[PDB]
Design a protein around this ligand. Structure first.
Ligand code: MG
Ligand code: MG
Ligand code: MG
Ligand code: MG
Ligand code: MG
Ligand code: MG
Ligand code: MG
Ligand code: MG
Ligand code: MG
Length: 114
RNA sequence: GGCCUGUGUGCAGGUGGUGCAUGGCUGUCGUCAGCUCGUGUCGUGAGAUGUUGGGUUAAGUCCCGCAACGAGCGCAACCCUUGU
């Protein structure tokens, strides 16, 4: 089950990877082929794992689970922030403070102060 | 009862000793700006981060990214005088 189709996935160009100086050998199984120094991701595996995460998140939301969105790259901060505020979900987009999850009691004081 | 003259009883009485046992008070480093704690994280262990680098100020006064998030004694203010 999917909503986003392969053709428009190619149009968006999500299959592109990094150069030959950064590829992790543990990602060889994912890697299909390299053309002009850029790797191509396996779209079948991508769709299957997207489906897996799809039912996982469906069950999590049905059972009442909370998911935090994390992203700091400049090119996605605005998009993540807009989507999170439209969907009413807590999010972080600009800076990740050290030990925010392992240390929640201390920052509870900061939240109460705010 | 108060007070004390003669006997003592305990005992008063000592600027006699011990600031290498002490209380309190005081001088210098220096009116220098440095010195700590809670949680977390890392390593086994004595431990490290926070307190690193750049900029700025008389000052750990402040800004920027960084496993750090906060707080404390200090710094300035609140007190006196002098200037209208
Ligand atoms: Mg003597
Ligand atoms: Mg002496
Ligand atoms: Mg000194
Ligand atoms: Mg350990
Ligand atoms: Mg150190
Ligand atoms: Mg240190
Ligand atoms: Mg620090
Ligand atoms: Mg120091
Ligand atoms: Mg200080």
């Amino acid at each position: 089950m999917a909503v986003v189709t392969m053709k428009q996935l190619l149009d968006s160009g999500a299959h592109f990877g990094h150069q030959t100086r950064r590829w992790n050998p543990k990602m060889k199984r994912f890697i299909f082929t390299d053309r002009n120094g850029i790797y191509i991701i396996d779209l079948q595996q991508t769709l299957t794992y997207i489906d897996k995460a799809y039912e996982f998140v469906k069950e999590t939301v049905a059972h009442g689970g909370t998911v935090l969105f994390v992203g700091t790259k400049k090119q996605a901060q605005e998009s993540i922030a807009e989507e999170a505020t439209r969907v009413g979900m807590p999010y972080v987009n600009q800076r990740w403070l050290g030990g925010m999850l392992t240390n929640f009691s201390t920052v509870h004081k900061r939240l109460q102060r705010l």
